[PDB]
Amino acid sequence: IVGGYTCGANTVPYQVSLNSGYHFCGGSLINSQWVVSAAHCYKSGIQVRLGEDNINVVEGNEQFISASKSIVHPSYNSNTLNNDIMLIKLKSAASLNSRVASISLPTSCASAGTQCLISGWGNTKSSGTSYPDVLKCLKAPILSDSSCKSAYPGQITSNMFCAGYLEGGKDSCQGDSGGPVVCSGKLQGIVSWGSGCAQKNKPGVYTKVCNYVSWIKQTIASN
Ligand SMILES: [Ca+2]
């Protein structure tokens, strides 16, 4: 997250770190046994780390749980990033309380102009590289359909939206992929892609979660 602020310990209690000997992606806890993340983050041997704030120090509150299943959406396209969503089943249920909690799925799409919270442990610089120890947050609005398509001609599907800032300096970034975009207490997006990070006229592009609510519930119920 570039241009964001330190969230504070366990103020985003649904935020997870996906770990393979290092932090590589984010995700969102949606019930005690299941996490939602981005398909482009798929790999085998995932450990899910819940209740994290400082990802390099054991502070108390963490729960580390192995992934037992990782289900990439069957229509995921790795060139376009269409259908960039995956579901991870935890090997055992997480223990939920005030510091570890699930986030609700949407019950309608969010409009243009709605303010959302985006969070993660990704790069905090637009040019070079610097990775934070603690969780960073950014408030960003959802942009209009037309501005999104003007920004990325021919690349925006109906399963994507843009959010952020067209003037530069505030965006999600590498290492934030798969992390949550929450508006009014609902998970509306998943951090997916963008051109650099925090460049002028190039906002972040997010998977539109409300299009996948029925798929998510059926996939959970079957697995
Ligand atoms: Ca920690």
Side-chain angles (χ1 to χ4, degrees):
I1 306 286
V2 181
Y5 60 91
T6 293
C7 308
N10 311 111
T11 58
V12 193
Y14 52 83
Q15 170 83 56
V16 325
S17 171
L18 309 184
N19 185 284
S20 47
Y22 58 104
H23 162 90
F24 70 92
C25 275
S28 304
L29 186 67
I30 63 163
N31 67 26
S32 72
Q33 277 184 109
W34 287 91
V35 162
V36 185
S37 179
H40 81 268
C41 293
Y42 172 81
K43 59 170 82 174
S44 53
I46 291 181
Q47 184 184 67
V48 176
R49 301 188 167 198
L50 308 194
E52 283 283 19
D53 183 39
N54 184 325
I55 55 172
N56 296 313
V57 177
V58 177
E59 289 177 304
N61 308 131
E62 295 95 352
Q63 300 173 42
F64 293 178
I65 301 165
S66 294
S68 63
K69 294 179 175 178
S70 303
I71 303 172
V72 169
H73 197 279
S75 294
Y76 166 64
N77 182 308
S78 68
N79 295 156
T80 61
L81 297 211
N82 194 32
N83 304 302
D84 190 12
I85 179 164
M86 91 161 160
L87 283 164
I88 297 163
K89 196 186 182 189
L90 307 182
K91 187 158 158 171
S92 49
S95 165
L96 308 195
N97 68 114
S98 89
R99 301 171 175 280
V100 172
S102 58
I103 184 70
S104 314
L105 292 174
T107 47
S108 37
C109 316
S111 328
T114 295
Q115 291 285 338
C116 303
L117 183 64
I118 304 178
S119 52
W121 292 269
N123 188 8
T124 60
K125 293 199 178 200
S126 47
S127 37
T129 275
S130 169
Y131 284 101
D133 292 325
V134 307
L135 187 62
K136 300 296 182 180
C137 275
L138 182 62
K139 297 225 175 62
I142 294 183
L143 302 189
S144 73
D145 68 316
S146 58
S147 74
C148 189
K149 292 172 186 315
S150 291
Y152 296 112
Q155 295 154 81
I156 300 297
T157 75
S158 62
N159 302 309
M160 305 172 182
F161 66 97
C162 289
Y165 290 94
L166 301 169
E167 72 267 33
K170 296 174 82 171
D171 197 3
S172 54
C173 199
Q174 197 189 348
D176 293 322
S177 285
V181 182
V182 174
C183 325
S184 313
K186 300 301 181 192
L187 177 66
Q188 291 281 3
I190 297 167
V191 176
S192 181
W193 62 275
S195 172
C197 66
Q199 304 305 289
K200 183 204 182 72
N201 303 129
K202 302 295 203 192
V205 187
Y206 300 89
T207 304
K208 185 186 264 213
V209 170
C210 63
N211 288 359
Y212 299 100
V213 167
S214 299
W215 183 75
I216 287 168
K217 293 186 171 219
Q218 186 53 243
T219 304
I220 292 178
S222 298
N223 284 280

